[PDB]
Each structure stands twice: as C-alpha cells, then as structure tokens.
Symmetry: D2
Subunit: 270 residues, 4 copies
C-alpha cells in the first residue's frame, strides 16, 4: 500500500534500515537507499527531518527544529519505498560505503559524532566515556579519529573487551584509585543514571564538559558549588544534523570509523 508522489519531493528505494525501547500511526529511523539529486543517487536519511525554513534550521542546528517535533523519520513521520518530503534531510552515501553500514551510521555513529564535535574534542583531549554499547563503541572510534586519549568504563566484561579492540587507551569496570579526580577534559555518559553522572562530575577537570548523552533517568542532579567553582559545563546533545551525517559518512568512507552492523525484529543490526 505504497505512496508515489513527487512535487518538491523524491522517491527513495530503501536498501537498508536499522533497528525504540523507550518508545515502546506511522511506519517506524535508520535509513539508507537509492533514488540536487538524480535517479541512482545513494542517500541516507537525517532522522530529525528539520523544516529547513526556521532560525534553527538556517541555523546549522536543524536537529532542534520546533516545526519538526513529531515529524522525525520513523518517529512521528521498516517499509519498501519512502517518499521523501524534504530532500534537504538526505546525505549522499560515498561509493565505497555499503547501504548496510550507512544505515547503521545514521544514529549509532551520528549521535556520538555530534556530541564529540560539540565538546570540541582535539588531540590534546583526555576523555572518559561511560558505557561502550551501540553508541559508546562508535564514540570510541569517533573520539580516536579526533585524536583524543580515551578511557572507557563499562560494567559488562564483553563491552570492555570490544572497547579494547576498538582502540580505547584504557578500559575499566571502575576507575582505580590512581586516577586523579578532576583530570578529564570531557566526560561522555552513555548511561546517564545518577551514579554515572556523579562519576562524570568527580572526574571532569575544571572548565571541562559533561555530556549526558544516555537517557537512563528522567532527572539528574549536579552539585552546584562544585559546578560553579570549577566552571563545569553540561551540554545537552540530540541526534545530529544533516552536515554531521555528511561528516560521519566521510569518516566511515575513509576507514576512520567501522560500525559493527550485523525481519525477526521482535526477537546494532541492519
């Protein structure tokens, strides 16, 4: 029961789609396919699907578009053909990147890329990442590509092992006593419960940044005296922008990031 219109629109034949739990009348957001654009172009979808006409979109921040709330690809707006209403929200897949890898890049890589870029990570950064799963594992690779030294905390042995293979410079279950408090230029929390926030706050340096990218609790608290006195910054981050997706696919193209991609959906995988 398919669509087919195009006035300022295009038609995308879906080649790969990635797989929500917190969510759980629209087809359900990690999309790569084939058709500023001409038939045969390979493209990936920028989930936040910004309007393109507001101050946020114009802007460089099309991910926080107020007009598109409730109209994100597969989350307000898993199917064989997708009529793309707003072709501005597409990114060209490079020739050497497969549709499967592109699809797996549209969120699992895009999201930590956007946060790392926001934090202004550089080859002198000394960063802490908490949680090395879907997002976290890609965050390791993105961070290393920015030149950073990367320390990973994860409760799960297997995630610690994967983190070592993906290039982390140190991996631990808990930070040992020899790690000085106040020594990391940035802390990225992919878990975001209170305990994990409190470690970011203890181990972030003065003027450093805490990026609570995970969504593990509805509220978090920070110590105010400490945040003020040491000028800590907490920056929210959501998904990514169209330009960020271009950047991600370039990194993936150049071999700097290799996402791990693997419909019994009910039972990252693409």
């Amino acid at each position: 029961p398919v669509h087919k219109p195009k006035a300022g629109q295009l038609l995308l034949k879906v080649d790969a789609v990635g797989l929500d739990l917190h969510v759980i009348n629209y087809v359900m957001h990690e999309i790569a396919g084939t058709v500023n654009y001409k038939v045969g172009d390979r493209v990936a979808c920028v989930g936040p699907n910004g309007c393109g006409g507001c101050k946020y979109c114009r802007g460089a921040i099309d991910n926080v578009c107020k007009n598109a709330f409730g109209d994100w690809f597969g989350l307000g707006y898993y199917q064989q053909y997708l009529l793309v209403t707003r072709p501005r929200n597409l990114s060209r897949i490079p020739d050497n990147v497969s549709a499967d890898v592109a699809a797996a890049s549209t969120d699992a890589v895009l999201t930590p890329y956007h946060a790392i870029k926001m934090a202004q990570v550089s080859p002198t950064s000394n960063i802490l990442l908490i949680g090395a799963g879907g997002l976290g594992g890609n965050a390791i690779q993105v961070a290393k590509a920015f030149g950073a030294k990367v320390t990973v905390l994860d409760k799960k042995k297997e995630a610690r092992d994967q983190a070592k293979k993906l290039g982390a410079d140190a991996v631990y279950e808990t930070l040992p006593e020899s790690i000085s408090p106040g020594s990391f230029s940035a802390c990225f929390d992919f878990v975001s419960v209170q305990a994990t926030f409190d470690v970011c706050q203890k181990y972030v340096e003065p003027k450093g940044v805490i990026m609570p990218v995970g969504l593990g609790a509805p509220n978090l608290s920070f110590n105010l005296g400490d945040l003020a006195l040491r000028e800590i910054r907490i920056l929210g981050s959501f998904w990514g922008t169209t330009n960020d997706l271009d950047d991600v696919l370039k990194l993936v193209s150049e071999g700097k990031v290799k996402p791990v991609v693997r419909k019994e959906l009910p039972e990252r995988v693409v």
Copy 2:
C-alpha cells in the same frame, strides 16, 4: 490576484525596460507568491558597468505580503509580511545548512533581482521561501526594504567581528553602509571612531552617535589601539590605516570595494596575529536580527518613498549622485 502585471526587466543587450504585459505565476508546491509592497534601489547601476544576469526582474531589496502559498508551505500563510534575503541560498548544501547561506555556490547567479527575479514588479514568485524573514508589526514595508542590504550588510560584518561593549572600533567611510554601521555598532555597545574625508559625512556621523569623528586620526591616537577596523572605502591608503591602528589579535574588515587588490604587511600581520575577514551581504538569520533591531528602535534607516513607475527617473539621479511602491 491578477493574472497580469507590470515590471522592469533587465537584458544584457537592451538594459532595464518597462513591460506592462508580465505574467503572474501560480506557486507550485514549496513556493509562494509575494505581493511587493516596497523595493529599494548603487549595485543596480553597476547594468551600466557590466556585472550578474540576463533577463530577470531587477530589485534586490524587497519587502512584501504573502499573496498565495503552494502545498508544503507551513511556515508562511497568506497575509504574512516578509522581507527577502537577497543571496537566496539553495537550502540543501553544506554552506546553507551551514548558517552561511550567503556564500551558497548553487545560488550564484540566482540572487533576488540579480540573476533571479526581484522586486521591481507587483508580484514575485519566491521559489525558496526559506529565504524570507518576517517583518515585525511595527516596522513598515519601506523601512524593511531599506534594511535588506543597507543595514543587513554592515550588521553581518559587525556580528562577524564579534563586537561587544568593550570594543574600540574604527570605521573608515560614513556613507550609505557606513552610517548604518555606526548605528549598528553603537547598538552592540561599542565605542565608535569614524574617519571620513567629507565634512558633511563627518557631521552626519556625529549625529548618528559616533563617539569621535575625524578627517585624519590625530597624533594622540596610539597605533595598535582598535579592536576592530571596518573599511567602507577599501583602497590601499585606508587599508594601511586599518593595519597601523588595529590592535594585536584585532580584526580588519575590508567591506568596501575601492580597489581590486589590497596589500598587507606580512611581518606585522604575523607577529601581531592580525586577522582580515571577508564579509558579503548577509544571512537569513542576520535579517531576522536586523529587523528586530529596527523594530526596537536601535537602528533607523533613512528612506524616502516613490511609485515604482518613477524608477527610471531615480536611476538617472543616483547615477549623477529610495524605495518604490508598486
């Protein structure tokens, strides 16, 4: 809304000519039709000097009222008052996405009234409504039109230079753009010193709020003491004053077009880490900002109105040294 209208079309072979038999386009999905309320008129003269297009309605300073909208237009509705963002960016490239839709490669040759159709007509088809800015209720269409370049352009430069209330700036040339620059810079809280060779421009500069105005900087002004220098003339001599009087780590903005090339002293630029920044027109978001400043009374552009049919008479006048209502 009518099916025909009048307007002034430019052709490389025969200049700018009245046509009273022009079509009025129906918007497609994604487009809108603007009823032109005011359209401003030196860049149109440059036309006589051989610059940008071939068979387009001129007029690049445009204010109007949305008359009809296509499908898939959700940001605007009939009756909305809007001003056009001249560079008319594509909206799909990295520059536009971006925050720098003023340097869009895909829109070169497609700017409003300078390659694509503009405001010297009654009804303008806007192919890219993203390139519109809402006119506040207390701002007239005439003043909005006069803001779309004369205020937009210096505002874009001043914002890029990151001027603040601790800035100590030098502006060279207080004419059309320079005078508006004075007002914009004061609204950012800056101290403003103005150099102009013409007595009348110096007088006007005082009236517009400059803190000091001079023909030449006196010997008591220390070299290396201004945080930013904006040069609205841009010949070598005025560049050299910017370079001598800019502070270390300060910025020179050569916003005028008085010479095709300018030289800088390299040892000085390097040692004192001087920055030279190019600036062109402005962005959509800059226009929103400008209209807010105008709305709040912080900037008051100077504008006289006339009927669009009078345009040829005023073109000759400007050529020998104003907005239009269609």
Copy 3:
C-alpha cells in the same frame, strides 16, 4: 579576626606593595589567620623584577589571585586555578589594612583615571561576577534574557546586560527589588512570569537565587540551544530534566567570580559610564559597625 601595629612588608623581586585606597565588604559574613576581598589602591613600592607596574599606578585586585604558572592561568582562566584555592585576596591570603603585599602582581587590574577607588573597589566582585557570566553566555543585542533575583549581583547584571544591548526580563519576589530593577533599565519586571510568556523563549537564563524552583523556571523558559547560568548558591544540588536538556540541547554553564582580564573590561565599562555601581564610603575604623548592620541586614578608606 580583629583590629593597630601590624607590620608592613617589603616586596621581594617579583612582588609589590599596594597602598589600599578603598576596600568593599556578603561572603565576608559567611583560609585561617587580613580579610577584605574587594580592593582598590595605589602601588607604593615594587620589587626588583617588576615591569608591568610602577609606584603611583592605581590598581584593583582580582580576588581569585591565580598562580600564573598553570595551564588554567596560561590559560585565560585564572579564576579556576587549582594552586590558588585557599590563597584568594582576603579569603585565605591577605584589603582591611593600610598596605597589602601582593605576591603575584599579574592579578591586578589598572583603574582608569576617571574611576574613583571607591567605585573600583565595589566593581571587583558585585560587577565582575555578573559580567563574567554574561560574557560567558555570549549575550548580544539580539538576546532575550531572563534574570532571576535582582539584589547586589542581579542589579549589576541588569546594567551589564543592557550594556550588551540585550532585552532584559527580571523576576524577583521582593517589591523593592522589582522597583530598583525598573530604575536600572530592565525591560520587564515581574513577581511571576505571566502565562502569556511563551515557554522556551529566552536565549539565556541567569539565576542569582539557584533553588530548585528557580532552576525549574530557567529550564522551562530557556529556548532550544539556550543557556542556563546558575550563578546563585541557594541549594547544594540541583536537578534538571534530562529528556528536556538532551532533546532541546540546553546548556548549563558554571561561572565563578571573574578573571584578571574581565576586571579590565569591567573597569572600562564603569569608566565609560555604562555601569554605575551603587557605593557609600566610610573610614576603615568604622568596619565593625557596618559588619553588624549588614548582619542585621559599602566601601572603606583606610
């Protein structure tokens, strides 16, 4: 810590001696073994190596008193120097006296000629602190800001913010603070934001109170990508809604006192008439009387 035969130190090579002209007095009420952290004076003697100052220079002290040698100080962020914790002027290190030894002259700001020592002293914290926060938030003439709490700091914040060209809305529970806020140039002043103010509409929210309720207003009214600056210290911990912070990309930025360069900036604004701190003068010997008064709730010439 009490009052008439204290010694006067001779500076070593890299030090200087400051003759105190004015010293300001809330935090004093709240290091071990001279207080007074809002200091203006005149250089009275310099040590052999000192090239940036000479006898007769009028200077104000930047309270955090950074070490000058660490990465934070080198840096541009001398206000968060780890080495100087416990060594701040009048809060761990020695203005409530006639002559102050400045170990570390980099932590001084030249007072402009047309600014009095009294005003300079009242600028060193009451103006410096909100200036530092406003500058960090990158306020501009297009900014639409909310300030909560219009007292000592908040009132100066109003004037600093208006100098940057911002539109300023003030919330305060106390009628008299609302009145002062109106006089100091705020564009709108309220006891509670009326229902007509749209949520998500302010580019920056500065909370000079910083209890939970006041944080929650900042979080409801800050626009996407906007900034919340919890400058007050009204609770030890505050909480934020995560989904909202992430989804709308809100930023919370800590701010502490100010830097040496910020103090140069503040004294320039004061010099140019942009900010006019409110100050009454008295003799330093009167200090104990004014301390009691503020408790049951001014600058001093030694």
Copy 4:
C-alpha cells in the same frame, strides 16, 4: 662543575654572527635559573636576521629552538630543580600583561626584542641564563633533547596555526612548503584527523612529505583539483605566487594562514575575499600551553620531527647550507 666562561655565537649588526670563546656564565638571581644547553635548532628565521636585516635587536647569542637541563636555580625557584630537562618557549612572555594572562603569551608587547635567541640570549652557547622560568616546558622522559629542540619552533609554530584554524577530522587542507615547519605541519594536521595535500618546489622535500603521511604531494596542483575546495591553506613560504595559490584553492569561508615570511608584503584579491568570505589569519610562533601540548604529542608518538644533529662549532657550515635549501628537516646542534 659549571665553568665561569664558555663559547657561543653572538650576532651584531656591524659584523654578523661570530664565534666568541670568552662569554660569561651567569649565576642566577633568586627567581632565575641556568640552563645547560643540550640541543639548539637552526631555523630559516635566523637567516632573515643575519642576511635580510630582519631586526630583533643587536648583540645577543642567537639560537631560538632550545632544549637543555637545569644546571642551577636561584633561591626562590621551586618548580624546577637541577637535572630537570626543559625546552624554552621562544617568545619569552612577561607573564603579567593582558596578553600573557591572556592565553596569548606569544604576542606579549613587553617581550618584543626579548625573545630567546632573537633579542635576548639564546641557545648557540653552552649555558643560558633564563630570567623567566615560567617560559619553560618540561621535556617528557622519552623525548630526546634533539627532538625537543626541533619541537620548540618547527613543530610549535605549525601546531599553533593548525589549532587556530580549528582543523578537525573533516578538514581538507593544503600545505605549501615541506621543510622544517611544513614537515611537522603534516604530522600535526594528520594527528588532528585532516586530509593533507602538500606542495613543495624541491624533490627531496616532496619525497619526505610522502614518508611523513601526507595524503597527496605535488609540485603543482593538477587540473583535477577543483579551485575553492580546501577548508584551510597553510603557506609556509609566503611569496605572492604561493599566496595566490592559497587564495584560488581555499573554499568559501575557508582560511588562509600565511605562516611563512618570504616577502615583506602580500596582496589579496578583494572582490574574491569579500564575496567568498575568505579569512586570513596571522599566526606567530606559539604559546607556553601550546609547547606542553606539542611535547605531549611528540611523547605519544603522533609527531616525529625530522632532525639531524651536529656539533655547535659546525653552525656556520649549516647556515650556508640552509641558505641554499640544501637539506631537508631540521638540523640541531649539541654545544
């Protein structure tokens, strides 16, 4: 122990750079230290001083790329002790002005004419008196003095410029010149994640650029390279012809960094700079924090400066060689 006399190379406007065997060795005062020089680099900037009248003062020991070991300290010095290995921050900032306080101690007004080996005494000698020990950076254990010396300028200068340009893993950058500075710039830029294209007029510098990790190296950019396609252009030569290539190939809103000093003046096309919003950013040397960052990159193996050593007495021979562009990479001298 420490001798009371020593040898070194002094510059004077009247008679150029000359060996002297009767130089004093100063005893530090309270806040000072004495550095025994282990390695000192030679820079193309020494040539501008000797042969082009680039005026930095008169009558000082040259050598501005300095690594050594603390030989004695004055009474009040606690941050360093005898035996510490340190490299000098060339601009030798005052520490007390707004620029130094600041984060920009490289453009200190007070220190004009007082830079190590360029107004104040430098490293072409056995023992250097350091008046301001703030302007030192600790050499990590695994970094040799020769490499640290090369790092104080040949690496520091391009690091500072690259950082100022905000190079990232999505940057596509052009570097012109692959000698002392340019070779390091290659490695620094790769550590920031950039794609790097190099131009050099000398075959042996091109060959070295390839070995240092450049993604492309050319004499002249081929036709397949689109104008307006580089996010940043770093010119380590800075003559009009190389500036023009930066200006043709930089993207809109991109940056041109004229780090080299090959002409007294350069010109730009104004219409092009304005229309495409090109930025030209001056960059000088680097800062104390930058040097700590650089030595950490070198220590972590991300940057491996190309350096060959020689005895300080050989300096006049290597000066001639550099003047004729006769070697690649840096040469440093052991006193």
